[PDB]
Amino acid sequence: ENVSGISAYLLGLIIGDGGLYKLKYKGNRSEYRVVITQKSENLIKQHIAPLMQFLIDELNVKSKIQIVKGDTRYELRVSSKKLYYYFANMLERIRLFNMREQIAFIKGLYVAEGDKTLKRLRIWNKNKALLEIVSRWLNNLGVRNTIHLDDHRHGVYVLNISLRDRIKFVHTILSSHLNPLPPEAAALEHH
DNA sequence: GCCTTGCCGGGTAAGTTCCGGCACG
DNA sequence: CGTGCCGGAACTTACCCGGCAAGGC
Ligand SMILES: [Mg+2]
Ligand SMILES: [Mg+2]
Questions:
Q1: Residue A17, C-beta contacts closer than 8 angstroms, at least 6 positions apart
Q2: Active site includes A17?
Q3: Is residue A42 within 8 Å of residue A183, measured between CB atoms?
Q4: Where is the DOD-type homing endonuclease domain?
Q5: A113 to each of A16, A71, A127, how far by Cα in Å?
Q6: Do residues A178 and A166 both lie within one domain?
Q7: Which of A97, A120, A139 is the endpoint of a domain?
Q8: What's the gap in Å between A80 CA and the centre of ligand 2?
Q9: How distant is C1' of B18 from CA of A10, in Å?
Q10: In the structure, how far is the CA atom of residue A160 from the C1' atom of nucleotide B10, in angstroms?
Q11: Per the structure, how many domains does chain A have?
Q12: Which of A9, A10, A163, A172 has CA 20 to 30 A from A54's CA?
């Protein structure tokens, strides 16, 4: 289905390049944030925001999409308790994603945390359990891969997709038309 | 002789949570 | 008064990038 695919894609971006934040203020006021950050303003406004707006309308979320310009990056932000729990509940059920959602998620995670040269196929993260889930998904998809500690300074692991399966990964996962195409995959397909 | 990939250091593109507003039952 | 949406941005590092070289065929 369309909504679940777009959801899983966004979650990959969120978990990779953003986050889910439950805030308490003096008040005792509060706030619930769904966030994706990115240096490219275009990527946020043109690729990401329209997907998020679609999801917001489909879920009848009344919150608006904020785009905040930071010193080093743009922030796409939705301030919404409803949208926050929607992604947070999805995240704790992540092991139950069907094939379609898995691929959408892996696309999203790769856009966020991946080696964008596509010369090497790598995903970095400190969350080892998250990479190990993605690893099992990939193996099941016929894409071989390994996980090692890539940065001993900060505790950042890397998931390395074997170049032996580069074509399978790029064409059947990054380029699947069952959910939104990541930027470079879309560009390759249109040449 | 060349592809693959573990491992590394460089430094910036990310992430995280604080601030002061306002709305609404 | 209790709580949730706006809009901004200060502050630290978790990523990405790209080089090196061991290993393997
Ligand atoms: Mg990340
Ligand atoms: Mg990124």
A1: A36, A37, A38, A112, A113
A2: yes
A3: no
A4: 10-143
A5: 6, 20, 12
A6: yes
A7: A97
A8: 23
A9: 26
A10: 21
A11: 2
A12: A172
Sheet strands (E) in A25-165? 30-38, 65-69, 74-79, 121-125, 145-151, 156-161
CATH assignment at residue A189: 3.10.28.10
A76 C-alpha to ligand 1 centroid (Å): 15
Q: Are residues A91 and A40 in the same domain?
A: yes
Do A93 and A106 sit in the same domain of this protein?
A: no
The answer to whether residues A190 and A142 belong to one domain is: yes
Check A113, A115, A132, A189 and give the catalytic one. A113
What distance in angstroms lies between residue A16's CA and the mean position of ligand 2's atoms? 7
**Which residues pair with residue A124 across a beta bridge?**
A158
Q: What span, in angstroms and rounded, lies between the C-alpha atoms of A144 and A160?
A: 9
Residues A112, A67: one domain? no
Q: Is A115 helix (H, G, I), strand (E, B) or coil?
A: coil
Stated resolution in angstroms: 2.2
Strand B proximity list, CB < 7 Å: A 16-19, 21, 23-27, 29, 31, 33, 35, 37-40, 70-73, 75, 112-113, 120, 144, 146, 148-153, 158, 160, 162-164, 166
Residues A145 and A191 in one domain: yes
Q: Are residues A160 and A116 in the same domain?
A: yes
Site of tokens 């925001």: A49
Nearest to A14 by CA among A151, A153, A137, A127: A127
Which one of the listed residues A17, A71, A150, A165 is annotated catalytic? A17
